[PDB]
Every structure is written in structure tokens, then in C-alpha cells.
Amino acid sequence: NLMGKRVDFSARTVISGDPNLELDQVGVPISIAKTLSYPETVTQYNIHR
Amino acid sequence: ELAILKEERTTTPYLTKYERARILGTRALQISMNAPVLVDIEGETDPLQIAMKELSQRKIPLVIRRYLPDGSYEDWGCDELIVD
Amino acid sequence: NTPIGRDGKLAKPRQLHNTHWGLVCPAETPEGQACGLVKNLSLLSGISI
Amino acid sequence: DPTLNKTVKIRQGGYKGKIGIVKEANGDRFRVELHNPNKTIPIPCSF
Amino acid sequence: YVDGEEEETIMIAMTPEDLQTRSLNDTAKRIKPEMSTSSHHTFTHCEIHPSMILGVAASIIPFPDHNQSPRNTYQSAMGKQAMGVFLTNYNVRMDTMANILYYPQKPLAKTQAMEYLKFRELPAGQNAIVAIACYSGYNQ
Amino acid sequence: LMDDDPVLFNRQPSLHKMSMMAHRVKVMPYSTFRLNLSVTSPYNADFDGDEMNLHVPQSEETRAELSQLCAVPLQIVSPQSNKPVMGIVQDTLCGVRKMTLRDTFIEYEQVMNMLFWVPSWDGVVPQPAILKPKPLWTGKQLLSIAIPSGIHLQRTDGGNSLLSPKDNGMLIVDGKVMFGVVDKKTVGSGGGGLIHTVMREKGPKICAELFGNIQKVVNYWLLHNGFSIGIGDAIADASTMKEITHAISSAKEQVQEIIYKAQHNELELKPGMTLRESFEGEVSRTLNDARDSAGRSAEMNLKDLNNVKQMVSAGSKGSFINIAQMSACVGQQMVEGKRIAFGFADRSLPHFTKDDFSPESKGFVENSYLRGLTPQEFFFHAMAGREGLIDTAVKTAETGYIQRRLVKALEDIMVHYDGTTRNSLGDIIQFLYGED
Amino acid sequence: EPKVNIINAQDDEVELMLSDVNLSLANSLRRTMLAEVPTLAIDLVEIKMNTSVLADEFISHRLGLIPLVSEDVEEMKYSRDCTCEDYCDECSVVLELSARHEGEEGTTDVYSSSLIKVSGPGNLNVGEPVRRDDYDQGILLCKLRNHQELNIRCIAKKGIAKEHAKWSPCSAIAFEYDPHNKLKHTDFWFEVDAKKEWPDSKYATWEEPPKPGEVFDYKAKPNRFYMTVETTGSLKANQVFSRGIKTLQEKLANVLFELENSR
Amino acid sequence: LETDGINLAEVMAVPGVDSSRTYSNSFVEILSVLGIEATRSSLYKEILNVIAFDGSYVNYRHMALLVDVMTSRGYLMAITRHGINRADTGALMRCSF
Amino acid sequence: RHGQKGTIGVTYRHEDMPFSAEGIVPDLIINPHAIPSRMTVAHLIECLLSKVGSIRGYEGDATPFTDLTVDAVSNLLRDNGYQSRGFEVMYNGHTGKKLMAQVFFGPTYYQRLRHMVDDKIHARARGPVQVLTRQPVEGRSRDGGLR
Amino acid sequence: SALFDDIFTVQTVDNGRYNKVSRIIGISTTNSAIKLTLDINNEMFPVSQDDSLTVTLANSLSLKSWRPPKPTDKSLADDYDYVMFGTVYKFEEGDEDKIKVYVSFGGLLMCLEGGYKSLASLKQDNLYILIRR
Amino acid sequence: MIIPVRCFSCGKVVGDKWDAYLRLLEEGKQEGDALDELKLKRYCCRRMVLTHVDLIEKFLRYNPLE
Amino acid sequence: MNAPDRFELFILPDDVPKLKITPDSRVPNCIIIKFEREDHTLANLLREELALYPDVTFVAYKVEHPLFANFVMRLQTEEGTRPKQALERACASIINKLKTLDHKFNEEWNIKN
RNA sequence: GUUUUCGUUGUUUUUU
Ligand SMILES: [Mg+2]
Numbered sequence A: 001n002l003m004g005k006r007v008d009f010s011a012r013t014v015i016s017g018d019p020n021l022e023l024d025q026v027g028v029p030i031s032i033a034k035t036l037s038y039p040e041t042v043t044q045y046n047i048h049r
Numbered sequence B: 001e002l003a004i005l006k007e008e009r010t011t012t013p014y015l016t017k018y019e020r021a022r023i024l025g026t027r028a029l030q031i032s033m034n035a036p037v038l039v040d041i042e043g044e045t046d047p048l049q050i051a052m053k054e055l056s057q058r059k060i061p062l063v064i065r066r067y068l069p070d071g072s073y074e075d076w077g078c079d080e081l082i083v084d
Numbered sequence C: 001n002t003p004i005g006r007d008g009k010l011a012k013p014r015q016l017h018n019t020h021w022g023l024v025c026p027a028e029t030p031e032g033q034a035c036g037l038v039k040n041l042s043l044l045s046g047i048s049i
Numbered sequence D: 001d002p003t004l005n006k007t008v009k010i011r012q013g014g015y016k017g018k019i020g021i022v023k024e025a026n027g028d029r030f031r032v033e034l035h036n037p038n039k040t041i042p043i044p045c046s047f
Numbered sequence E: 001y002v003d004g005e006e007e008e009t010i011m012i013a014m015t016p017e018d019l020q021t022r023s024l025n026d027t028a029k030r031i032k033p034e035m036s037t038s039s040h041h042t043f044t045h046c047e048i049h050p051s052m053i054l055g056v057a058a059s060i061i062p063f064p065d066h067n068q069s070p071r072n073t074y075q076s077a078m079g080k081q082a083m084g085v086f087l088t089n090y091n092v093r094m095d096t097m098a099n100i101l102y103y104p105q106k107p108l109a110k111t112q113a114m115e116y117l118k119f120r121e122l123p124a125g126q127n128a129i130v131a132i133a134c135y136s137g138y139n140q
Numbered sequence F: 001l002m003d004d005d006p007v008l009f010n011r012q013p014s015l016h017k018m019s020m021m022a023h024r025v026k027v028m029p030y031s032t033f034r035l036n037l038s039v040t041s042p043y044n045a046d047f048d049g050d051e052m053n054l055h056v057p058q059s060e061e062t063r064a065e066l067s068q069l070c071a072v073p074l075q076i077v078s079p080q081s082n083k084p085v086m087g088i089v090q091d092t093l094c095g096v097r098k099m100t101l102r103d104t105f106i107e108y109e110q111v112m113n114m115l116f117w118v119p120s121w122d123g124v125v126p127q128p129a130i131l132k133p134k135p136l137w138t139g140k141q142l143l144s145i146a147i148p149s150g151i152h153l154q155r156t157d158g159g160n161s162l163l164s165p166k167d168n169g170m171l172i173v174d175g176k177v178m179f180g181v182v183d184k185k186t187v188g189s190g191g192g193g194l195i196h197t198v199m200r201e202k203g204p205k206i207c208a209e210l211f212g213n214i215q216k217v218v219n220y221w222l223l224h225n226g227f228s229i230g231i232g233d234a235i236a237d238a239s240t241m242k243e244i245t246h247a248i249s250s251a252k253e254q255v256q257e258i259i260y261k262a263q264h265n266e267l268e269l270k271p272g273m274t275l276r277e278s279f280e281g282e283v284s285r286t287l288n289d290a291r292d293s294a295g296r297s298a299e300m301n302l303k304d305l306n307n308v309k310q311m312v313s314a315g316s317k318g319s320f321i322n323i324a325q326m327s328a329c330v331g332q333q334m335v336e337g338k339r340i341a342f343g344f345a346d347r348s349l350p351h352f353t354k355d356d357f358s359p360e361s362k363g364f365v366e367n368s369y370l371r372g373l374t375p376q377e378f379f380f381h382a383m384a385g386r387e388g389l390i391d392t393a394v395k396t397a398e399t400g401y402i403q404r405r406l407v408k409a410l411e412d413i414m415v416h417y418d419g420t421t422r423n424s425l426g427d428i429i430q431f432l433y434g435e436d
Numbered sequence G: 001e002p003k004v005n006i007i008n009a010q011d012d013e014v015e016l017m018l019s020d021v022n023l024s025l026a027n028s029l030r031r032t033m034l035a036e037v038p039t040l041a042i043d044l045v046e047i048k049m050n051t052s053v054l055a056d057e058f059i060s061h062r063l064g065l066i067p068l069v070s071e072d073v074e075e076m077k078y079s080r081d082c083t084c085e086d087y088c089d090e091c092s093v094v095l096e097l098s099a100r101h102e103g104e105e106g107t108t109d110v111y112s113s114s115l116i117k118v119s120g121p122g123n124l125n126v127g128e129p130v131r132r133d134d135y136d137q138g139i140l141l142c143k144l145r146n147h148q149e150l151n152i153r154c155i156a157k158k159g160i161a162k163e164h165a166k167w168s169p170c171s172a173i174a175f176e177y178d179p180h181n182k183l184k185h186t187d188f189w190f191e192v193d194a195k196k197e198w199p200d201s202k203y204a205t206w207e208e209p210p211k212p213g214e215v216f217d218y219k220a221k222p223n224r225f226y227m228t229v230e231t232t233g234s235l236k237a238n239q240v241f242s243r244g245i246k247t248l249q250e251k252l253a254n255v256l257f258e259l260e261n262s263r
Numbered sequence H: 001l002e003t004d005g006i007n008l009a010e011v012m013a014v015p016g017v018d019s020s021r022t023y024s025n026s027f028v029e030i031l032s033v034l035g036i037e038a039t040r041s042s043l044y045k046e047i048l049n050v051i052a053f054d055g056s057y058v059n060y061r062h063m064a065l066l067v068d069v070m071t072s073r074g075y076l077m078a079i080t081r082h083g084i085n086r087a088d089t090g091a092l093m094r095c096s097f
Numbered sequence I: 001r002h003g004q005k006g007t008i009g010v011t012y013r014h015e016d017m018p019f020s021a022e023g024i025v026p027d028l029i030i031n032p033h034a035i036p037s038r039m040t041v042a043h044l045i046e047c048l049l050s051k052v053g054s055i056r057g058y059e060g061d062a063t064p065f066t067d068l069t070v071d072a073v074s075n076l077l078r079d080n081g082y083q084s085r086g087f088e089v090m091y092n093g094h095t096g097k098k099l100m101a102q103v104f105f106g107p108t109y110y111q112r113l114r115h116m117v118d119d120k121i122h123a124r125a126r127g128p129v130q131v132l133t134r135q136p137v138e139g140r141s142r143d144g145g146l147r
Numbered sequence J: 001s002a003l004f005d006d007i008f009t010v011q012t013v014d015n016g017r018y019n020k021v022s023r024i025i026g027i028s029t030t031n032s033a034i035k036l037t038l039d040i041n042n043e044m045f046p047v048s049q050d051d052s053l054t055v056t057l058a059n060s061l062s063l064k065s066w067r068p069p070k071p072t073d074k075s076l077a078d079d080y081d082y083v084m085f086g087t088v089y090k091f092e093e094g095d096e097d098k099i100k101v102y103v104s105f106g107g108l109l110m111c112l113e114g115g116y117k118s119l120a121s122l123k124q125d126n127l128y129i130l131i132r133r
Numbered sequence K: 001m002i003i004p005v006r007c008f009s010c011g012k013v014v015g016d017k018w019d020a021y022l023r024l025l026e027e028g029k030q031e032g033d034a035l036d037e038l039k040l041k042r043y044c045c046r047r048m049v050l051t052h053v054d055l056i057e058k059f060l061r062y063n064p065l066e
Numbered sequence L: 001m002n003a004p005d006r007f008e009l010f011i012l013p014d015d016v017p018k019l020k021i022t023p024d025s026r027v028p029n030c031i032i033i034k035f036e037r038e039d040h041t042l043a044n045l046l047r048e049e050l051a052l053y054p055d056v057t058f059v060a061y062k063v064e065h066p067l068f069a070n071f072v073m074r075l076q077t078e079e080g081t082r083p084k085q086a087l088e089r090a091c092a093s094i095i096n097k098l099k100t101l102d103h104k105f106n107e108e109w110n111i112k113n
Numbered sequence M: 001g002u003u004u005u006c007g008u009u010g011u012u013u014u015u016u
């Protein structure tokens, strides 16, 4: 439980290869992104957004 | 006794990637908390680009504190570190 | 099944031996822990009653 | 909302002519499940 | 018959042909032994069909004598994990897991014993037109 | 979770720091994780059924830290042996091998399309190598277009000349391919490589975009050429097998003479190695020589067009002895560092007489996969394969144990502002990290 | 400039000599016919009840795989276009099949003939199940045994093969040109020689075999192509050819219309 | 000369033998006779000999630190439970091992 | 049937695949890389003889230790008016162009495997945890949190 | 504008492993000791041994993004029948009179052994190689 | 288990010919010969029916619950 | 479960145009055309016809990624001709060539029967 | 009206 542990905001699936993808890039299934979320402050630069 | 005088800051004048990133993240979080911005924001709505800009301009108002293995700390100002 | 146990890695048991000639499937075997120990009747092996 | 849990079918749109059921109707917008596809889609109330 | 221990004290003819002492040069075939160190042979038994030393899964591979043994073992293990037709009464049986190919095909290249295994009768795959090529770098 | 957002990237087992990275989100439909094919090398994985793991940041300081530290380009070079870890691989690698073939010519509009395939293109089309009669471009030209400017490279392959009579050797100036056929030794993960120098000079971003454009153009050209393989690639002409058979006969004669030597109490004893053990060593050396000469003759027979030969030359997959065993001869069987033993009393199989020692009589394979394997040699190969798989299964676990123990051994050590190497307790290990 | 010379034509197939045109254009037109031909296939399969031994979705899928007489598919609107609530006869067609096996022994082999055009945007000659012959029951659909009834009601809708391969009107469409590799667009693999190891193209007659000493002309270009326009039966190879041409033409007209409108 | 079995002190002084370059494959005898640092030298030598026997290379500094770490106290700290746990470091670590 | 596991990279439409002079497109494409690495000679023999039978209309025995020569199969195929080694010219489907090489092309028996893609997809942001440790629960079936 | 000119009889032609391109050896019939090696596409310009070939080099053919050659425009190449664009990658300052000028035409190499004055003008970067017939 | 409606590869409708193909089989006409009769040239087509396995009858063999 | 819709392969969304223009500042009289709901069928066809034009300096298209019904092309017509006019010229040229072949095929099918 | 929950421990199997 102390070194290793189950952690939220973590996903697992099969890998895929793509020449049309950047080295640092990665192809993310859309449903995963919708499922996952990033807490983010309400700032003026994005308030309308 | 705890700090080290400004003159004997024997540490390199460059900024470690460690401290560099710590500074960048700290500044980005600060601005994201509506902190006043020491540089201008044109369209860089995201905090992190603003933080990187303020760093390149060396306009980040923070001071390092480098704890030596002996335990003593020396304090380096963000503006004086040699950004590489 | 080989009820020898996994205590002690060793190589003799999991290793194939000439004396399975025509007795167990030489190629089929489990992977990892079960590899080399569990066996299978060859297509012409017959068991005495 | 008691206008849910009932058979509903589409009159116009990209999936015109598909049966479905209503699950969530937070407000002024209806989300519907479909039978042939194992998916649930939004759609305005009027379609 | 012969058990493991009985196998040792006997001399078998690995083929029906090998019983008769033979007397050519084909580059598309395996190579048989020389067998010249002993001018005299007293054979005792013969191999009905040596390819019967396999397992049920192992025998499904075509020409397994042309690939690496580990590959054969892998195919043997995995074949038990490909979906297909295993029973006829599936519909009546209430099972937690059951998956069936719509159109199982008896493989074009089929071994002999498969008749005994009904695999042609109970196939678990399809024969598909294939190309061995690098098309869009997505086949890697 | 919006696109381009930095996120973590973790695969197992995590042997070394390159086993994990952080990436920029690019959401697409379908339910698999899509990876630029170069990333695989440090991940040492293929699409044979491999999963993946990821973690998403929930704060900005974390997001900045990832972006600035775990950025994949930052880790292009490997301190492991202070060299690049990734490299151009597989379809791209073998394809680029063929792009750089001297008699490589490209049509105008085709060149136009590839040039458009580079998002890092200058917008300035190069002149063709030939202008009369028909304007044509060489793949070297497009490759140079991909490369950034101000780049330089040379490599003298085997003491060659500047004229490169073999088309071997390599030279780049200002990122312009001067000559040579690109290979793993050039664009692999080896040290000093083109990729390495690009990293060193043009920093991370340029070297990563280099990989991206390389994939783009290489794969596009290949597509518009295609590449395949056929069974015929693994079969030689009759005279070649004749020579192979003569060599095999000579080697077996050598072994038989060694047998007549040892049996009459005439074979000399090796230092610290018994007459039986000397005999075994001599036999093994003879069989190795036999298979080596045979595979060498076969390879020599091969035509350059052979997809197998093209492939070994490209080296993105395959090796010489692969050809040797595929076509010429699998060769001698080895078990625990020895031949096939007498699992039956005084013989390995009931189908052989007692007390035989001919190469085949103790585990020599003369055939190849194309020739098929007789049951005895099949079984010896199967024994070897079972042994090897067992050894792999044992080694992976034992090595994992060793790695765990070691990492526990040195989990706290650090370099410090003083430059010393001290532990959590502060006891200095090295007076200077690497003395440097 | 474009030329046509039918070598062999048929209801299902049209095999012609297309020359004096571009390789790219020929490929594009082939793609147009194969994928860009709207057609009509069983889409909305609906079971009032069933008793057969096969999965309802399996039967539905096999039903979609049924080519339907699609002569007037050009005329009927897409279902999406039509503004009527639900479908109407002008935006979809109604067929029905309802087969039962009676008798404790035997097996009633349901056939596509059992599918019947209940409705459809008349008098459009559409929704008619395609058959090799009138006596040809058609494709075997289902086998009903003792006390096995089948009642179903389906709705088909006009669509394109791009949307789903069931709409593919052409069973297959080959292609070639320059069978002698005069343009040398391919490198011929071999061990001794490509010539004695490679067969000869069926269209090889249309082009002479290049002379031994003839010097290569790098101005040689793909001019004469070879074609056979198969149809799965829902439409005629000539109708398929013409309709694919018309679809390409309409796409180009729309593209230029956008060119003028956006400006 | 390459010998089977190791008897460091006895052989080194043998006539006809380079006592100044005599080497043992066993670093334990190096510590016994040639103290700590030469023991570390033979240690690393054999380590790399095994590691690079394949020809594969690893950056020196890492192996240097490794051999250094296990020579810190001046004697052999064998990599097992006893030596590492015998370390005077924080209990929370040594126990965790 | 030769340990050649593979997952679906991507699907191409009928037009999208490259096509033979006969118009035949492959059902699936594979990486030439594996063959030299894996030495699946029996795989090539299988595809060849499969094409031979399909052309000839029969089912061939695949029993090993059988002297069926690949050269004999080549004789039969060349008799069938086909490239003895299964090479076939193939065309870019996207442009219709010839492809500069010729393609080993044919049928082969293949097998779908239980480990379907969605069998494994899983995510977790917040939900069930172990009461004993208040930590994310285990198991994809049970909202497992990545260890 | 010809930075160099000479006519060469092909001593040997070498396809070697390559087929579309042949490596050739020729000596300037005008002057011996001018050893020229060149790489040229067999098919696009076939040749054979002992072929006397005019050889000429000019830095510019105008009598930067490349564009299809308008037939309206003329060029020194209009007189020639096989033309390459190349780059000067080694202008050797060798022996007393052995100056080896090596030019790469995007992969096509060439060895030019000869007098310095014969090659003194050829200390350039991008040279067009011009061959008659 | 039943005949496919079309040829996977090209999409040629094939189900109808099955009964006819089976009839051709009844008289032991050679596989290749019968295939030729059906005007099924492309082995992309020939393959399925050449190795198509039909087992719906085994389901009919089972006494249906009704 | 994340797979995109099949019917959208040809349906253009209302908010987006079928075509999108963008001038290429990096070189003179060069534009960039962003494409939607189109593939090699139209792309290569238009590209070849245009490439046959003499008044074009550059032209090239590519599909960014197969999963998306949208690709791009970078045209540059020489100074006199702005790219858009050569594009519509190629459109009309292919229109007339296709109509010619259409009437020809009508004639040949009519006569053959 | 906001709000709001399913078990363990084992076993065996494979998944790399
Ligand atoms: Mg795996």
C-alpha cells in the first residue's frame, strides 16, 4: 500500500502505431478524454471559454 | 550563520533545470491564481507561456535557497541566475 | 500435471528429455511457471489400467 | 419528469427513423438511447 | 505397444521405407540419414506415422517441420484462445462465456489427422486473401 | 481532457527511466493508444497485444514539471551508454535504405508531393539532380530537404574513397546528403548518429521533428513504391546447394577422421580438457565451420534484389545466420553448452544404434526449414527451443530480483551543490561524480 | 480526347478499351463507381416475431447484403433529406418477408423471393429483389423447421458504399495498362529471368511486345487502360458506368459552385 | 601463467614471477593482501569484464559509483540482506528492503 | 497457424487497398519484417498451397514429414498460369498506379482471438476505494485503479 | 561561360551492381592525364565504351525555388543533351599538378584528376556538368 | 454455418449458387470443375465455397422448443 | 465504442465549408486549400489535371491522417494566374473531358448492342 | 430534495 498503490486519473489499453503522429504526441480515445478531466482555475483569460 | 553571504555564493551562476522548472511551475500557478504579471500577456491565455516569458525576461521575483549538504543555505535571486 | 512444486527453479524437470519419445506433445507446454512441467498425451500414447 | 422511460423515435436528422428511449432530461434538451447501436445520443426535444 | 522403458531395448524403423536397406539429390527436401557405420541391421519395429507425437493443438499447424519450435509451441498454446465452433447445443446451454464465428471455414491447408479432430468439421477461423507488404507504415 | 495537454506515459516492466515518458494529448476516436513508431525502441514493444498505462496531471505545477522534465525529446539521448536510444526502424528504416540507392530517380510531381509531405519544408523546391533531358530528383535530395541546415557528417566505411565505388560511406554537409546509403549504422540508435548530432546541435525539438518528417516522407515514397516478400527469396540455385553439399560432405569426413583418430587412441589432448571433452570441442568446431562456410556460400549466391538480402543489408530486421538456417542449414544442435545426450541408454533415440557418434548421431541438423526437418532433428531443435524458453523465463525473474535488490541498495544517493556524491546520511561516496 | 471501345459488354459486366486518358483519371473514375454510387439495400430490419435458429442481427446483416433492383435510386431522395415526420414512401421503401415451416419433418428454405416489395416510391422500379433468374428463388435466406415461423418487416434506404459496403454496386472492378511494362513501372522479381517466369497479360494482345534493341522512351506515359465493369446485379454495368460518371461530374460541378460562392 | 585455485600471498613471492603485477580473479584475496583500493580496482575490472564480455558498453561513471558505494566503509559490503540492512541508514529504508 | 499473432492496425475500403491486375485486393496486409525474424516458412508454404487449391478447387493435406515439395507446388502454379512463387503485380488503389515491385499474394487461414480491444479498456478518476485503506479498488471489472 | 570544357573518350563503362546508372572511366582525348570519373543514368542517356563525349562545366546556365523549365527561356544546356545540377564537395589540392575535383549531383559522384589550371577555375560550390550528344 | 451472402473480398453474391453448387457436388463433379461451372473464376470467390462449412442443419437437428 | 460515424464520410457539416482557402505567404501567388469530405478520388484527379497546366508553378496535396475526411493542397500558379482561376479551369476541363467520355461511352454501348 | 452502497480470501487460468 505504501510504495505501490492504485491511483486514480489513470487509464490502460492497447498501444497503436501511427506514422501520422508526432514523437511527443499520442493518440487518445475520445471516450477516455471525456471520462477523464483536469481541474482548472476559473481565470479571466478563459472565463468566457 | 544559517545563510551564506552574497559574495561567497560559490554555486554555479546558471539555473539548474530543476530550479528552472520549479520556477516555471510556481510562476504559472501564481499567475493562474490571478497574481499580477511582471510581463505582458498578448494572447498567451495559459499561465505557463506567461511564466516562461517572464523567466526569459528574468522578471520573476523569487529567490532560490540552496541548502548545502552541511545544511547551510545560500539564497540566489531569480533575476541573477544565468538562464541557458 | 507435475506435482513437484515451484520451490527451486532447477532445469531437469521443465527440460525435455529423449525419454518422452512419442509419449507427450513435444511442442505444447504452458508459459512461465507452468512451462515445461504440465504435459499432454501424444496422439498415440496409451495409459495402462 | 414523467415524460421519460417511454418509446421515442426520430422524425428528422442524421438518424431519422430510429427507435429509442429517454433517460436524462436535465432541461430543454433530451438524451436518447438507441436500439440497433449500443449508444446514447443527445437531441433537442422537438425532433 | 511399447511403454517408455520398453522403448529402449528395441530398434524401430522410423519409416516403413527404412525397413528395406536402400540403394535423388533434390534441393527442395529434407535429408535422410546415411546409416553406414553398421553394414547389418536387425530392425524390430516401425514408425506407423512419426508425426503422431504431437498434441491435438500442435497438429493443427501446417508443415510444422519448416518453422522454429518455439513458434510451433506458441501457436499450440494460442490456438486454444481463438474463437470458433466447439459445440452444436450452444443455444440451449446457458453459459457465461460463448463466442462463435459466423462463418467458420475448414482451412485450405489442412493436415490429415484433422479428419480425426473434426477441425474441418468444426473450424474456428477463415481463409483470407493476404498481402505480405509494407503499405502505409501502419502494418508494423 | 483537452488535446495537446501534457500527460504521463508508463509501460512495464519499467527497467529504466526511458521505460516511461510524458506526452502531449492528441485525442482521436477508436479505443487504442496511438504511438509514433520511433517511441517503441525504448519501450521495446510491438503491436502483438501490448497494453499501456497513463496518468493525467491535475495541477499546473505538475503540468509544467512534466512538460519541462518528462518531455520525450529531452530524453532522446541515453546516458545508459551516453548514446541515442531510439532510431529509424522497420518499414521506415528499410525504406530509407532503398531511398539512398545511387540509381534512385523521382518524378517532378512525385517530388512535389513529398516536398509537400514535410511540414518543415522551406517552401523552396530543390533543383533536380538531372536537368536534361528529363528533370529528375534522387531520394538523397528529398532526404536532405528533410534534414535541417548547417548539419555535417562523414563516415569512412571500411577504408573507402571519397568516390565511394561501393556506394558505401556517408557524407552530409549543411544537412545535404553528399553520398552514401543510409543504414542502422547511420540512423539507428548507435552513438554519434545523425540523430545524435541533430540532438546535440539543434536541440530536442528539431531532432524530434526530424523523426516526424523522416517517417512522413519515407513511408509516403514506400507507399508509392510498395515493398513485399515471397517464399522464393529464401531459396537458392542448384549449383549453390551442390557446393553446400560438397562442403557438408567434407566436414562430415573431417569429423569421421577425427573419430578414427580418437578411437585408435591417437587424438591429442587439449589443455585441461579431456579426450572426450577435446573430442566434443573439435567436433563442435568442425560443425560450426561447416555451417559457417555453407551459409557464407549461400549468401554469396544471393542476388541484391532478394528481399531477404535487401532486408539484412537494411538490418531493420533479420541477420545473416537467419539466412544460413532458413536456406542452407540449421546446423548443429546445442544443449546446456553440449550436444544431444543419450536420454535413452547408450543412445539419444531408439531409432539409432548404440554407441554412434556421427554429427547427426548426436544432434547435427544438415537440412533447413525449406528442406524440412526429419523427426530426429526436429526433436533436437524442439529440445533446444524448450531449453531456451525455460532459460529466458528463469533469467527474467532472477534479473528482476537482482534489479530490485540493487535499486534498494542505492535508492538515496545524490550529487550535491558541492558536486560531491553523498547518501541520505551525507557520507560522501565519490569526491567527484565520475571524477568529472 | 477520351475514348471508349467495348471489348466485351454484359448486363453485369462492361469490359472496354479506355485510352487517351490519364491514369489518375481512370483510377478516380473506378473509385467513383466502386464507392461513390448511391444504391438501396436492406437497412432497417424489424422483427414482428421469429422462430428460426439464427441470431436476429445475423439475419438482418444477411438481409442488408441483398442487392435490390436500384434502377431509379437516382430518383428517390435520401431519407435524411426528406422533411416528412418518420419516413414516407418518397424517402424509403417497404418490403416484407414472412416465412413459416409447417410439418413436423422437413425444412422450409426461405428465399429472397419471399422478400416482397410491399411499398416504395412508385412507380420507381426499385425495391425489387435482384435474382439471377425469375425461377431462381434468389439467395437462400433461412431454413425453417417444424414449428418454426418467421415474420419480419424491413425498411431500406438509399445510400452509398462509402457509408457501407452493402451499397457497393460493383462486385469487382479490375484495372491495368501497359501489360508489357513498356513504361517499366514495375521491377520484375525472378531467379533466372522475369520473362520465362512470368505469365502474359490477357490484354497483352492490345500492345505489341517491345522490340529487343528498342531504346526506352522516358516520354512514354500511361495511355491505354483495360477495364471490366462488374455489377452485383442491383444495376447495369452501363448504368453503373454512366451513373458513376454523372456522380463525378456532379461532385465537380458542386466543387466549382463552392469555388464561385465562397468568393 | 594462469592457475587453477588461488593462493595470493604464496605465489606472488615465487621466483620467476612478476610479484608486482600478479593478479587474482578473486578480489577477496586482493583485500587480504592488496588492501581496499586495489580490491576496488580488481572488482571493477572483473565487473566490466563480465558486463562487456558481450561487447556491450555502459557509461563508466555508473559502475564507478557502484563499486565506490560498496567500498565506502573500507571493507566488502556484500549485496545481500545482511550488509545493506547492517547499514546505519534510516530504519524506514533498511527495513523496507 | 504459425504463432503470428497480430492486432488490427487499420481497415481500408475496397478502393483503398492496392489491387491486382485481376482486381483482387488483399483481405489483410502484414509486415514482411516478421518472416525473416520468425522463419515462418510453413506460413509461406501454407499461403502458396492455399492459393493453389483455391485456383484448382480441392483441399490439400498439410501433414508434416510429407515430401510435398515447394518446387512441385511452383510447377503446379506455373501450370495454373501464375507466378510460380506467388508474386503478383499490384497497383496503388489511391492512384491506380502500378507498384514498382510485385507482391507475394494469396489466401491463408487466420483466427480471431478473445482478447478484443474493449475487453481491456479502462479508466478511473474517482469512485470505489478499499474501505480498509480508502485507496482505489482493484480490477477493471471492479473500477480497478492502476497500481 | 563554360568554367571548364573537354572531350572524353570512354575508356570503360561500368554498370556494376547498379543497372540504371553506369560508372565510367574516360581520358580527355584533348589531353592525357585528365582522368575523369562520372556517374550517369544508363537509360536516360545510354552510352558505351570508347564513346567520345564533350564535357563542359558552367556555374550558371541562365543566358530560387525551382520551377518547370519554360520552353520560352534558353540556356547553355539548350546546346547539350545530358545535364546535371551538382555540388562541389571536394576540390582537392593534391600533387604538383594532380587536382582532384569531386562533385556530387545529389548522389552522383565524379573524380576529376588533372592539372590545377585545368581545374583552377573550378573552386566553386554548385557546378552544372554539360555533355554533348 | 450457412453460405455467405457475398464474397468477402470482392462482394460477389454467392449464397444463391450454394444449392446449385451442392447439386453439382451430388454427382461427384470435381471441385474445380463445378467451381468453373458456377462462373466463379476469382479464387477470392472460389475459396469460401471450396472450404465453406455449413452446419445450420445441426441446429435444425435439435428439437426446437416449439 | 470510440469509432466515428460512417455516414459522416460524405456529409459536410453546415458550419464548415466543403472547401477552405488559405494563401501561402512563404512563396508568391501560392495558396493552401483545406479539404473536407474528399479523398484521393477528387484530390488526385484535380491534381493531375492542374499539373498538366503550364501556368502553375507548384501544386501538391496530401491527406494529414486517414481517419479524417479532410486533406490539404498547396497550389502556386505563376504570377499572371492566381491559383483559384487555374483550379476552376481544371474543374471545367475535367468536366468537359468526362462529358466527352460519357457521350462516347453512350455511343459505344449503343452500337455494341 | 437536495442527497446517496457491495464483500472477502483463496484458488486456477491465461494476458507480456
Ligand atoms: Mg506479447
Ligand SMILES: [Zn+2]
Binding pocket: G082, G083, G084, G086, G087, G088, G089, G090, G091, G092
Ligand atoms: Zn419522406
Ligand SMILES: [Zn+2]
Binding pocket: K007, K008, K009, K010, K011, K012, K042, K043, K044, K045, K046
Ligand atoms: Zn470474390
